[PDB]
Amino acid sequence: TPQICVVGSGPAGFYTAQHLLKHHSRAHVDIYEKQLVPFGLVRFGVAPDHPEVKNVINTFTQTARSDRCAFYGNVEVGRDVTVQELQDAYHAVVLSYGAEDHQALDIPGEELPGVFSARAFVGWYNGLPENRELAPDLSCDTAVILGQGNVALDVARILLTPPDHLEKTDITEAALGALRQSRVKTVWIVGRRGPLQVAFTIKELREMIQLPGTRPMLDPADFLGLQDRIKEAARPRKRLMELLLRTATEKPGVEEAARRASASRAWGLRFFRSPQQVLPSPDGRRAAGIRLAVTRLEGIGEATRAVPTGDVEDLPCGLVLSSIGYKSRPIDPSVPFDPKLGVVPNMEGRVVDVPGLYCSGWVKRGPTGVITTTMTDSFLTGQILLQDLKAGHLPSGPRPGSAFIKALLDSRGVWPVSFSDWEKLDAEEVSRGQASGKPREKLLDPQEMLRLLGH
Ligand SMILES: Cc1cc2nc3c(=O)[nH]c(=O)nc-3n(C[C@H](O)[C@H](O)[C@H](O)COP(=O)(O)OP(=O)(O)OC[C@H]3O[C@@H](n4cnc5c(N)ncnc54)[C@H](O)[C@@H]3O)c2cc1C
Ligand SMILES: NC(=O)c1ccc[n+]([C@@H]2O[C@H](COP(=O)([O-])OP(=O)(O)OC[C@@H]3O[C@@H](n4cnc5c(N)ncnc54)[C@H](OP(=O)(O)O)[C@@H]3O)[C@@H](O)[C@H]2O)c1
């Protein structure tokens, strides 16, 4: 009876577990999670207006309800239980704990009230307990987001959607309340490079262009000569660039021109600008602008980089969201960690020089794929692990699994959240959603969550 444990209950943990249970009829999989609840970024990252994307929870739930899978929330691996303890109890351990850090801007002014990582702002409207008191000040009229990735688009879309259109989503009631009072009418999404280097994808770009109550602000000068350079581009890329190009250069029909003229909000893309400094209000109590270094591109293809021209531009704004990526964080002394790539060093999921220890998802590859990328990547890890298990490369003999770990946790005063505990809070969140017409109303207070969890 093979005992495997998974550290992290987001898409990598669940798809790794799912692959292991499907391809090995005896193996048992225990999934550990630091938060009180499961699902990682499916619950706390994916936007409330992308409910479609969260449907993978239904298959995670079937896996968690099966006889050979168990969930242990409220357990911080590296703190409540060490990786070495897990290695001693299981035949194999998979690190699937994501990239829990935001990359900082590393610029002056970054400490002013009104500056946040997009991550934190997302965690706030998605009910991540640690961001429940973020209390972003939306009394300003312009927000600036740095980074032109899908995350940037999510934050801009939430800031500009007519609040009534988010009423029936699972957005927190607190964030929706704040959004109803927001004075933000303009959002600029600023990239260091040009149009050809944007990192967002077409579904999200179209959602922005078509967002009711808004008009797009693209400078055609940013796109001169684009059709020409995208003629040998890959189909998806080319389609995206053509959608951007049209939005920037086609004069709209009479109806769309009217709709754009009556719009109360606007969003735009700014290119060739890198963040140099957040500017304070005269009294230093808030952000009042962002100083951007003008840049120009040098290099060919993917090797192209922005290099400063020496010119600067100041752009007034009261909200600055850095949406420039992530880094995983080390978890425990027994786990190698590369501070540079911000990943656990590994060879196709096998952690370097640590027999029995594997990894999957963002902590394995770096923070850049969508859920399906994470899924097929977790499957690759799952294949190598199971081939190692079958081959007899992991310790021979019994391995106690949770029997041993719970006894440690029992003594240490740590009471894990089982999946059935979670099911109780899920029912409560869902029922609370019934009265208000939402999918659920997430509990944010850890104390109240613990009570509703049966703790
Ligand atoms: C804002 C945002 C929006 C996104 N939107 C989409 C989208 O619309 N569509 C899409 O396909 N993809 C989207 N993605 C991509 C998707 O979030 C990632 O592909 C996926 O979540 C990565 O999976 P993961 O399991 O590696 O990491 P995560 O989902 O982060 O999960 C890691 C898990 O490990 C837990 N953990 C961390 N430390 C510990 C510890 N010490 N002990 C135990 N457990 C621990 C974390 O709490 C978490 O639950 C988005 C990402 C972000 C940031
Ligand atoms: N629906 C979906 O499919 C979906 C939805 C949401 C999120 N996601 C995913 O989640 C993953 C991570 O997302 P992400 O948006 O945070 O990052 P990302 O996709 O990698 O893009 C963000 C980056 O910020 C920029 N950047 C980095 N450092 C910078 C700096 N110091 N100053 C200015 N700009 C800087 C990079 O610009 P440069 O390119 O020029 O260097 C790039 O735009 C992605 O794979 C994204 O697709 C997917």
Side-chain angles (χ1 to χ4, degrees):
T1 175
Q3 295 286 169
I4 303 170
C5 66
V6 160
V7 177
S9 65
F14 268 110
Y15 282 121
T16 299
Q18 184 196 280
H19 178 94
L20 301 167
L21 297 164
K22 174 182 190 174
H23 296 274
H24 192 114
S25 66
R26 304 282 277 31
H28 189 281
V29 178
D30 286 338
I31 297 169
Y32 290 85
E33 162 65 49
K34 180 176 172 169
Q35 297 296 316
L36 297 182
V37 300
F39 309 140
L41 294 168
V42 183
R43 180 186 172 88
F44 297 124
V46 175
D49 57 351
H50 285 159
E52 55 290 352
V53 178
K54 300 174 184 279
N55 282 323
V56 306
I57 286 170
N58 298 321
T59 195
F60 298 159
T61 295
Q62 293 300 300
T63 296
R65 288 173 181 159
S66 73
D67 291 1
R68 292 185 285 139
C69 184
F71 167 86
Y72 298 92
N74 201 26
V75 177
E76 178 174 342
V77 176
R79 186 193 62 191
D80 299 327
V81 60
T82 69
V83 173
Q84 190 61 66
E85 288 160 349
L86 293 179
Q87 291 180 271
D88 295 350
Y90 293 87
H91 292 99
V93 176
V94 190
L95 300 181
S96 297
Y97 68 86
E100 202 175 15
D101 255 283
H102 67 266
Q103 281 283 11
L105 251 15
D106 291 333
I107 65 179
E110 189 178 7
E111 74 292 349
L112 293 161
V115 185
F116 302 91
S117 59
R119 165 164 205 274
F121 187 85
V122 171
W124 168 74
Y125 63 64
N126 278 337
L128 183 64
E130 74 205 76
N131 301 124
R132 69 184 181 287
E133 292 300 313
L134 197 67
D137 185 354
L138 310 179
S139 64
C140 57
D141 60 30
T142 298
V144 166
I145 299 170
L146 304 160
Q148 292 175 322
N150 281 326
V151 174
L153 293 190
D154 279 354
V155 169
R157 188 181 62 258
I158 296 299
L159 280 168
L160 295 189
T161 297
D164 299 341
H165 298 210
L166 263 13
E167 278 183 356
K168 292 201 156 297
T169 67
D170 70 1
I171 189 171
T172 67
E173 66 182 335
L176 180 58
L179 288 168
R180 289 189 167 100
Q181 303 305 328
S182 169
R183 296 185 58 271
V184 179
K185 290 181 191 305
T186 299
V187 179
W188 296 102
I189 310 175
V190 187
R192 302 181 293 192
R193 296 189 297 160
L196 285 159
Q197 294 77 37
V198 302
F200 52 64
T201 52
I202 199 165
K203 174 183 168 207
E204 306 76 10
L205 170 63
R206 189 187 307 287
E207 282 178 343
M208 209 69 216
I209 296 176
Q210 304 199 93
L211 197 61
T214 71
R215 54 186 178 93
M217 302 182 290
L218 300 178
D219 188 340
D222 290 331
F223 294 89
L224 106 167
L226 182 66
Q227 190 68 60
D228 260 61
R229 193 150 54 183
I230 67 172
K231 79 205 306 178
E232 308 296 355
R235 300 288 303 283
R237 197 64 177 162
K238 172 189 280 194
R239 186 179 174 223
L240 181 65
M241 299 294 113
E242 291 176 343
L243 170 66
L244 276 174
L245 217 206
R246 275 185 292 290
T247 302
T249 66
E250 289 193 346
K251 185 284 197 63
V254 185
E255 290 158 285
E256 174 67 17
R259 186 188 79 66
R260 287 184 183 184
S262 60
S264 68
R265 300 187 187 197
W267 61 280
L269 261 20
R270 298 296 311 285
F271 292 105
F272 317 108
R273 297 286 181 291
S274 59
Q276 174 172 302
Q277 176 188 338
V278 181
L279 306 169
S281 49
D283 68 5
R285 310 200 64 154
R286 55 200 279 195
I290 180 157
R291 179 162 293 156
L292 305 168
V294 180
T295 70
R296 54 183 176 81
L297 305 178
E298 287 180 353
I300 307 178
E302 304 299 308
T304 82
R305 329 309 288 168
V307 297
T309 66
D311 287 354
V312 299
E313 169 184 359
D314 294 348
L315 181 66
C317 56
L319 192 74
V320 176
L321 303 176
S322 52
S323 186
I324 65 167
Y326 308 93
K327 279 194 174 181
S328 295
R329 172 189 294 187
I331 183 171
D332 178 300
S334 153
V335 180
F337 186 81
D338 168 4
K340 197 169 184 183
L341 301 170
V343 304
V344 172
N346 71 95
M347 193 321 87
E348 293 303 312
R350 302 213 194 90
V351 177
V352 183
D353 288 334
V354 188
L357 186 61
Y358 295 75
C359 55
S360 67
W362 275 23
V363 77
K364 175 181 169 188
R365 298 291 187 196
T368 53
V370 292
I371 296 174
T372 54
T373 288
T374 298
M375 179 178 67
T376 60
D377 166 75
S378 296
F379 296 164
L380 293 178
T381 288
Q383 290 180 67
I384 297 178
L385 189 163
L386 287 187
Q387 177 55 68
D388 298 344
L389 183 174
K390 170 169 184 170
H393 294 106
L394 308 172
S396 176
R399 300 274 153 148
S402 58
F404 175 68
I405 304 307
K406 292 181 205 206
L408 290 181
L409 299 171
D410 281 340
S411 300
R412 278 162 202 175
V414 174
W415 174 16
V417 171
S418 64
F419 202 77
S420 6
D421 292 339
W422 154 252
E423 296 264 26
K424 172 188 297 179
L425 177 64
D426 179 51
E428 187 59 19
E429 298 182 335
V430 178
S431 295
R432 290 186 175 192
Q434 285 293 298
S436 54
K438 298 176 59 169
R440 59 182 66 231
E441 187 68 57
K442 296 176 179 173
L443 272 298
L444 307 189
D445 177 38
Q447 255 23 72
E448 185 180 5
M449 301 165 57
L450 279 169
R451 277 149 28 208
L452 296 175
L453 284 174
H455 295 220

